[PDB]
Design an enzyme around this catalytic site. Structure first.
Site, PDB file in Angstrom:
ATOM      1  CE  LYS A 210      -5.866  -1.252  -0.616  1.00  0.00           C
ATOM      2  NZ  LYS A 210      -5.539  -0.093   0.251  1.00  0.00           N
TER       3      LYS A 210
ATOM      4  CB  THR B 234      -0.939   0.023   1.210  1.00  0.00           C
ATOM      5  OG1 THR B 234      -1.823  -1.112   1.185  1.00  0.00           O
ATOM      6  CG2 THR B 234      -1.807   1.292   1.189  1.00  0.00           C
TER       7      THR B 234
HETATM    8  C1  LIG Z   1     -11.569   1.647   8.555  1.00  0.00           C
HETATM    9  C2  LIG Z   1     -10.693   1.417   7.351  1.00  0.00           C
HETATM   10  C3  LIG Z   1      -9.414   0.953   7.540  1.00  0.00           C
HETATM   11  C4  LIG Z   1      -8.570   0.729   6.458  1.00  0.00           C
HETATM   12  N1  LIG Z   1      -7.301   0.242   6.678  1.00  0.00           N
HETATM   13  C5  LIG Z   1      -6.466  -0.020   5.615  1.00  0.00           C
HETATM   14  C6  LIG Z   1      -5.237  -0.578   5.837  1.00  0.00           C
HETATM   15  O1  LIG Z   1      -4.888  -0.810   6.987  1.00  0.00           O
HETATM   16  N2  LIG Z   1      -4.400  -0.855   4.807  1.00  0.00           N
HETATM   17  C7  LIG Z   1      -4.784  -0.604   3.532  1.00  0.00           C
HETATM   18  O2  LIG Z   1      -4.001  -0.870   2.615  1.00  0.00           O
HETATM   19  N3  LIG Z   1      -6.009  -0.063   3.276  1.00  0.00           N
HETATM   20  C8  LIG Z   1      -6.862   0.224   4.326  1.00  0.00           C
HETATM   21  N4  LIG Z   1      -8.126   0.744   4.112  1.00  0.00           N
HETATM   22  C9  LIG Z   1      -8.560   0.980   2.708  1.00  0.00           C
HETATM   23  C10 LIG Z   1      -9.281  -0.254   2.226  1.00  0.00           C
HETATM   24  O3  LIG Z   1      -8.325  -1.282   2.095  1.00  0.00           O
HETATM   25  C11 LIG Z   1      -9.927  -0.030   0.872  1.00  0.00           C
HETATM   26  O4  LIG Z   1      -8.942   0.457   0.000  1.00  0.00           O
HETATM   27  C12 LIG Z   1     -11.111   0.910   0.924  1.00  0.00           C
HETATM   28  O5  LIG Z   1     -11.854   0.605   2.075  1.00  0.00           O
HETATM   29  C13 LIG Z   1     -12.011   0.652  -0.270  1.00  0.00           C
HETATM   30  O6  LIG Z   1     -13.110   1.533  -0.265  1.00  0.00           O
HETATM   31  P1  LIG Z   1     -14.530   1.137   0.260  1.00  0.00           P
HETATM   32  O7  LIG Z   1     -14.641   1.185   1.733  1.00  0.00           O
HETATM   33  O8  LIG Z   1     -15.399   2.178  -0.296  1.00  0.00           O
HETATM   34  O9  LIG Z   1     -14.906  -0.235  -0.209  1.00  0.00           O
HETATM   35  C14 LIG Z   1      -8.988   0.974   5.176  1.00  0.00           C
HETATM   36  C15 LIG Z   1     -10.272   1.433   4.978  1.00  0.00           C
HETATM   37  C16 LIG Z   1     -11.118   1.660   6.057  1.00  0.00           C
HETATM   38  C17 LIG Z   1     -12.514   2.169   5.787  1.00  0.00           C
END
Ligand SMILES: Cc1cc2nc3c(=O)[nH]c(=O)nc-3n(C[C@H](O)[C@H](O)[C@H](O)COP(=O)(O)O)c2cc1C
Ligand SMILES: CCCCCCCCCCCCO[C@@H]1O[C@H](CO)[C@@H](O[C@H]2O[C@H](CO)[C@@H](O)[C@H](O)[C@H]2O)[C@H](O)[C@H]1O
Ligand SMILES: CCCCCCCCCCCCO[C@@H]1O[C@H](CO)[C@@H](O[C@H]2O[C@H](CO)[C@@H](O)[C@H](O)[C@H]2O)[C@H](O)[C@H]1O
Ligand SMILES: Cc1cc2nc3c(=O)[nH]c(=O)nc-3n(C[C@H](O)[C@H](O)[C@H](O)COP(=O)(O)O)c2cc1C
Ligand SMILES: Cc1cc2nc3c(=O)[nH]c(=O)nc-3n(C[C@H](O)[C@H](O)[C@H](O)COP(=O)(O)O)c2cc1C
Ligand SMILES: Cc1cc2nc3c(=O)[nH]c(=O)nc-3n(C[C@H](O)[C@H](O)[C@H](O)COP(=O)(O)O)c2cc1C
Ligand code: NA
Ligand code: NA
Lengths: 373, 373, 373, 373
Positions: C248, C154
Site C-alpha cells: 500500500k 503500508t
Molecule cells: C485519520 C486517518 C488515519 C489513518 N491511519 C492510517 C493507518 O494507520 N495506516 C494506513 O495504512 N493508512 C492510514 N490512513 C490512510 C487511509 O488508510 C487511506 O489511505 C486514506 O484515508 C484514503 O483517503 P480518503 O480519506 O480520502 O478516503 C489514515 C487516514 C486517516 C484520514
C-alpha cells in the site's frame, strides 16, 4: 513558538512592521500578477515517490560552485535589511553561517562590505548592480581584499520597477513626516522604538564624511546605475574579478549560455521576486533548458517558500536556491533568531520531502521524481 | 492625486459620472464574457527579457502608415464623448496632438467633422460607419476637404449590440426623467451641473433644421445604418477616398487579406471593445496570423489598459494600438488634462517596459521577447 | 435525518467531534493542495452512457483477490478510530461484515489484533507499517494465528507527514489541558462525556506493563518505524506470510510491477489521503498504467466520496476501492449505525450510477464508458 | 417589462414559485457539477465573424425532419408544468404555435394527449418514456389517432436521478402539510392562491374513474417504467409508429448511429438537463461526431440559455435545439405571455447573433464561424 512554516513568519512580520515597510518588502511590480505566477508555477509539477528505498540515512549537503555546503540554499541579496531589524545584514549572515550556507551582501546594504567581513567569517558573497566602471571597481576591490569568495552581477534593475504600493505610500528616500507616516509608526510601537533608538539606516557602501546622510547616499547610488552595461562591460568585470563570477537576473537559456561564453562561472535565473516586470516569466520556465544548454551551475530564485518548491528546482537541475523574502520574514518578525528558525524549518522541510519521495541523497534528484501535470 | 495607472482613472471616472453614463462607457454585450476575455487574453504571453543590452537611450517613435509619430498609439473613435466631458471630442483631440499621436473622430461625435478641424491641427482621422452611399458620400467629402488624412470604415455595427446595462437602466435616447434618473443626477452634482449649464449633447454630424433634437438625430443615424455593405461598397469607397483607407472591426486574417485586396491600406483588428458580440474572439488571437497573411499595416484595439498589453501586441507584429476606454477614463475624470495624464503614464509605462525587456528601440520588437504559455 | 450522501455525515461528524479531533481526521499535509487535488482529479473523467441496455437486474458483487464480496469496496486501515467513537474499530468492522466487505485493521488501532478477531467474524485484513523485523514478526504472527486473511504493508510513513492542523492545535500525544482544550471539550459535551466515561484510548497493539500509557505506546511505535525497509525486507515479509500480500502507498506503475515481482499478490495505489506529502500525485493518475503494467489486482484509495468516483476507478481497471474518511464520518457521527448508513448510501449510489450509465454488471465496466476531457 | 433575457425570467420565477417548486425546476442530480458543465461547455467556442457580408435580409426558418418551421427551436418535453402555471402545458403549446415551432408533450403532463390536441392545432409531438409494451401502445395510439406528427422516446430515466434538493425538501407525490410546506406556501401567496383555486395537478395521461388521484396516478406511472427496454423494444416501437420517430437521451455517436440502424428518423442528444447523472458529458461533446457519423437529423438540448449557445450547436451540425428550463422560466413567471416573451427574445437574439457573425441564412452555418479555444 507557534511557527511551523515560512507563512507563519510572514504573518508575524506584518504585525510588527508598519504597513509602509511591509509593503516595500511584500509588494511587486504593477498588478502583481508576477509574484502570484512565481508561486503558482510550482503547482505545475507533482511528485512520483519511489517506495521501498532505504532513506534511513539522509544527506542534504552539496557542492555549489565546487564548494561543499550543508544544504543547497543561500540567503540571497536584499537591500535595506536594516529597515527590518537592527543590524539585519549581520543577523542574516550569522544565521546563514550557523546553518552552513553562504550569504549574499547587497550593494544597497545597511552594513558595509568591510564591516560585515570584520564581524562574521562565513562564506560571504557580494552582489554588484550594473553600474559605471569607476566606483564599481572600488567596491569589487574592497570585496576582493576582504575575502569575499564570489561576485554576483545583478542585471535586472537598470531602471526601477513600477511598484505601486510604494507609490501609494510615498515610500521614497526623502521621507519626512505625515499624517500616514506618524499614524503608521504609532500603531507599530515595537518597530518605531527600535527605529528611534537606532536611527535612520544608511546605504553603508556609499557612506563617507561627504555623503553622510541617506538622502545623499541614495542620490549617489542612483546616479551610478548604468543602463548601458553590456557584454563588453561583463568581460571587463571578469578580468577585474579573479574568483567565482555569477550573473543574476537572467530569464533565458540563451542569455545564460552567453554569460558562460564571456567567462561567468554560472548564472542565477531570477525575476527579482516579481518586483521589476509584472509580466516576466518565472525562472522555473527556463531552468531545465538553461541547465541542459550550459552544463554549468544554474542557480535560481523568485517565489520559493516551501521545501517542495526548492526540491522541484533541484530535480530539474538547479544547483541551489536563493531565499529573499522567506528569510526576510524571519528577520523582521524576530531578528537573527527568526532567521535561524526559518532556516531550521526549511532544512527539516527539505529533509522530510526527500524522505517522502524516496530519494535519500539530494544529489541524486532528477526529473524522474516529477510528474509534469 | 494617487493616479498611477489607467485603473486609477477608471475609479475616478466612476465617481464623477452618473451610474447610467458610467454603464454606457464601461458596459459590454450580454454577459460581458467578452470584455473579460479581452483582458484575460493578454495573460497568454509573458516576457523573456534580453539582458546586458544597452537600454540607456530608448526610442518610442514609429511609422504608422508611413508617417512618423511619437509612439505607436492612437486615440480611436468613440461616440458620445460629450456625455463624459464638455467638448470631449476636442479635449481628446488636443491631448492626442500634444502627445504626438493621431485622433480618430467618430461618425457619432458631439462635435462636427468641420468644427473639429477648425479647432485642432493634429493628425485627424475620420471613422465612417457602414451606411447608405448618399449621406456617406457627404461625410467622406466634408472630411476630405477639411484635411483629414485617414478614413477608417467600421464594419461591425450592421446591427446594434445587445448591451443589457443600458436596457436595465432605461438608458435610451428619448430619456425623460424618473426617480432613478433624478436620483442618479443628484448624486453626481459636478456632472449634472456641467450638463445643465451646457445642455443635451447632439449628434453633430446629423444636425439640421429638421433633425434639431438628439432624438431626431439618433432616429436618422440608425435609419442610415446599412447592413448590406459588402465588398462592392468597399471598392466604391476606395474610389471615393484618395488617401489612406483602413477597415476596422475585422476578426480574421482572411477578411484582412480581402480588405487589402480590395484596396485598403491596412486594417484594424477589433471586436469593438466587447460591445457588439459577447462571444467574439479577442483580436489578439488572430493578430500574428493577420500580420503574416497580409504584410500590410495591421492595427488593433480591444482590451488595452497596461503598457505591457501594448508591447505584447507590438511584438506580435501590430503597427499600432488604438485606445478606447483607457483615454475615456482620463477624459471623464479630468477632461483634457486627464487625457494628457493618461497618455503621459502610458508613454512612460511603454518606455519602462522596453527597458525591462532589453529592447531599446520599439521598432525591433519581435515574438523573440515572448513566451507563449 | 437529512443524511443523503457522505458530505452530510461530514457535516454531522464536525458538530459532534471537538475541533482538534475533527482536524486530525480531516487534515492533510502542509497547504492541503493534495487533499484538494485528490477530489478534483475525479473531474478529469465524465460518463458516456450506453442506452437501450437492459439494466433491470443489476449486480454489484465482485471478486477481490479471488474472493467474492458484495461490492468492490473495503473499509481501509485508519489509526485512532477510538478517538471518534467508543470501540470504533469494532463498529467499523461489524458494519463492513454486515455489508459483506473486508475491514482492514490498522497497526495503530485502539483495539488489538486478537481482541478484534475474538469479536468479529468478517473478512479481517491487517496492515503493517514499515517497522523493524523483530516486533513486526510478532504482529504478523498474531494476525496469522487469529485468522486474518490478508496482510497489507503500508510503505509511505517512513517519516511522519507535516500536518499543520495538528501542530497549530497542539494536538500531540502528551496532551494535558489548556484554555483551548477545555473550551473545545466543553463545546462538545456528547463527545467529552463519552471520553470521560471511557478514558484515554490506547495503542492496543503496543500495550504491556512497561508501555502502559498512551505516551509510552506512541513513544515505542515511532521508535519502531523503519525507514530502511527496502525490497529485501519485502521478500523477508513475503516468506513470513503465507496468505495474500498487498503493498500500500504506491504511486507508480514501476513500483507496482516491482512489488508484484517480489511476490506481492497486488498493490494499493495511495497517497495516504493527502496526509503524508502535499504535492504527491493522486493515484488516479497512474491507475490505468499500473493495471496495464502488472496484470495483477490493483486496488486504490485517496479522495473517494461519491459513487461516481468509485465507478470511474473501476472502469479504469481497479479491482476495488478502500474508504478512509467517508466511513469515518459515519463512525464519528453515529457509531456503527452511522457506518452502516454510509455503506448503505454508497451501495445504492454505485447501483444507481450503473443503471444510469447502462452497465448492469459491475464486472463489465471499462474505459468505454468514460470520456477523458 | 424590465426583462431582456432568459435569466431575468429565471429571477422572476424564483420570486413567484415556492422554494420547493423552484428547487424541483432548477435542481439537478447530486452535486450539480452537471448543470454547471452544461453551461460552461459553451465557453469552449468563440465566434469568428465574416465582415462585409450583406446581412440586410436575414432568415431564421429551417427544415426539421423535412418540415419547415420559423426557427430551429422546439419547446421540449417537461413533466408537471401544471405546478408552474395553470394549464401550463396548453400555455406552452400555444406560444410554441404562435412562434411557429413544435411543442413536445410529456408522458408526465398535467393535460392529456387528447385534451391538448383538441385545444391547439400547432405541430404537437409526444414523448414516451421507456415503459412496458401494453400501456405504452395505448398512449402511442391515442397520439397517432389525434394527429401527433412525431414520437420521442426518452431513454435516460430508467431509474430516477438522485436529486438532493427534492430529498432535502421531501418533494414527493404524497405531500401532506408541514411546517415548511405551509410556510413555503404562505410566503408565495400568488402561487398558493392559484393552487387552491385550481387544485392538485394530475398526471393526466394516467387518469380514469379508477386512478382518480395524483397519488394513484404516479404509482401507476412508476410501475410502468421499464428498465429492460432495449434495441428489440425499439424495433417494436418503430413498427407500431408510422410517422417520425426520434430517440432522446443519447450521449454517444455510437448509440446515435445504432438508433438510426433500427429505424429511428433521428436522435436528440441530451443529458436531461443535468437531472439524471451529475457526471455525464454535455451532449455538445458528441454533437459534431454524431452529426458526422449518422448523416441524419441530430437535435440537442441541455444547458441552452442564450442565442449564442443555440447558434454554436447549429454551426456544429445540430438540426434544432430543444428548450426545457428556458421557456419554463417564462411560464411560471408570467404564464403563456411569459413563454411568448421568452421565445420573442430568443428569436431576436438568434437573429442578432447571425447579423453580428455575418451569416444571413441560418442554414449556411458551419464550424467556419467558430474558433475552437
Ligand atoms: C485519520 C486517518 C488515519 C489513518 N491511519 C492510517 C493507518 O494507520 N495506516 C494506513 O495504512 N493508512 C492510514 N490512513 C490512510 C487511509 O488508510 C487511506 O489511505 C486514506 O484515508 C484514503 O483517503 P480518503 O480519506 O480520502 O478516503 C489514515 C487516514 C486517516 C484520514
Ligand atoms: C523611481 C525611483 C524611486 C526610488 C525608489 C526608492 C524606494 C526606496 C524606499 C525608501 C525608504 C527609505 O527607508 C527608510 O527606512 C526607514 C527606517 O528603516 C523608515 O522610516 C520612515 O518610515 C516610517 C514608517 O512608519 C516612519 O515611522 C518614519 O518616521 C519614516 O521616516 C522607512 O522605511 C524609510 O524612512
Ligand atoms: C425515488 C423516486 C421518487 C419519486 C420522485 C417524485 C418527485 C416528484 C415531485 C412531486 C411533487 C408533486 O407536485 C405537487 O405539485 C403541487 C401543485 O403543483 C404542489 O403542492 C405542494 O407544495 C406546495 C409547496 O408550497 C404546498 O403549498 C402544498 O400544500 C403542497 O401540497 C407541489 O408541487 C406538489 O404537491
Ligand atoms: C525587499 C527586497 C530587496 C531586494 N534587494 C535586492 C538587491 O538589493 N539586489 C539584488 O540583486 N536583488 C535584490 N532583491 C531580489 C532578491 O535578491 C531575490 O532575487 C528575490 O527576493 C527572490 O524572490 P522571493 O522574494 O520570492 O524569494 C530584493 C528583493 C526584495 C524582496
Ligand atoms: C463608449 C464607446 C463608444 C464607442 N463608439 C465607437 C464608435 O462610435 N465608432 C467606432 O468605430 N468604435 C466605437 N467604439 C469602439 C472603440 O472604437 C474601440 O474599438 C474599443 O473601445 C476598444 O476597446 P477598449 O475600450 O477595450 O480599448 C466605442 C467604444 C466605447 C467604449
Ligand atoms: C422540470 C423538468 C421536467 C422534465 N421532464 C421531462 C420529461 O417529463 N420527459 C422528458 O423526456 N424530459 C424531461 N425533462 C428534460 C427536458 O426535456 C430537457 O431534456 C432538459 O430540460 C434540457 O435541459 P435544460 O433545462 O437546461 O434546457 C425535464 C426537465 C425539467 C427541467
Ligand atoms: Na566597506
Ligand atoms: Na388522452
Amino acid at each position: 513558538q507557534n511557527l511551523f512554516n515560512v507563512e507563519d513568519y510572514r504573518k508575524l512580520r506584518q504585525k510588527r512592521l508598519p504597513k509602509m515597510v511591509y509593503d516595500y518588502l511584500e509588494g511587486g511590480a504593477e498588478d502583481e500578477y508576477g509574484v502570484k505566477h512565481n508561486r503558482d508555477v510550482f503547482q505545475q509539477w507533482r511528485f512520483k515517490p519511489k517506495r521501498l528505498v532505504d532513506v534511513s540515512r539522509r544527506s542534504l549537503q552539496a557542492e555549489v560552485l565546487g564548494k561543499r555546503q550543508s544544504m543547497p540554499l543561500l540567503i540571497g541579496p536584499t537591500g535595506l535589511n536594516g529597515a527590518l531589524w537592527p543590524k539585519g545584514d549581520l543577523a542574516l549572515a550569522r544565521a546563514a553561517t550557523k546553518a552552513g550556507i553562504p550569504f549574499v551582501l547587497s550593494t544597497a546594504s545597511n552594513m558595509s562590505i568591510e564591516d560585515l567581513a570584520r564581524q562574521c567569517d562565513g562564506d560571504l558573497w557580494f552582489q554588484l548592480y550594473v553600474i559605471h566602471r569607476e566606483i564599481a571597481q572600488g567596491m569589487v576591490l574592497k570585496a576582493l581584499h576582504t575575502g569575499y569568495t564570489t561576485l554576483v552581477l545583478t542585471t535586472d534593475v537598470a531602471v526601477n520597477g513600477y511598484r505601486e504600493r510604494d507609490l501609494h505610500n510615498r515610500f521614497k528616500i526623502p521621507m519626512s513626516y505625515s499624517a500616514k507616516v506618524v499614524l503608521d509608526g504609532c500603531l507599530h510601537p515595537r518597530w518605531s522604538l527600535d527605529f528611534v533608538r537606532h536611527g535612520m539606516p544608511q546605504l553603508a557602501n556609499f557612506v563617507s564624511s561627504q555623503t553622510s546622510s541617506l538622502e545623499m547616499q541614495a542620490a549617489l547610488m542612483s546616479r551610478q546605475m548604468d543602463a548601458s552595461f553590456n557584454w563588453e562591460a561583463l568581460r571587463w568585470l571578469r578580468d577585474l574579478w579573479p574568483h567565482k563570477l555569477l550573473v543574476k537576473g537572467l530569464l533565458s537559456a540563451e542569455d545564460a549560455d552567453r554569460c558562460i561564453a564571456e567567462g561567468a562561472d554560472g548564472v542565477i535565473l531570477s525575476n527579482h521576486g516579481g518586483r521589476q516586470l509584472d509580466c516576466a516569466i518565472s525562472p522555473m520556465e527556463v531552468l531545465a533548458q538553461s541547465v541542459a544548454k550550459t552544463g554549468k551551475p544554474v542557480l535560481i530564485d523568485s517565489g520559493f517558500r516551501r521545501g517542495s518548491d526548492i526540491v522541484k528546482a533541484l530535480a530539474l537541475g538547479a544547483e541551489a536556491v536563493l531565499l529573499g523574502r522567506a528569510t526576510l520574514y524571519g528577520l523582521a518578525a524576530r531578528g537573527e533568531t527568526g532567521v535561524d528558525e526559518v532556516l531550521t524549518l526549511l532544512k527539516a522541510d527539505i529533509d522530510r520531502t526527500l524522505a517522502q519521495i524516496g530519494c535519500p541523497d539530494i544529489t541524486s534528484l532528477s526529473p524522474d521524481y516529477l510528474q509534469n501535470e
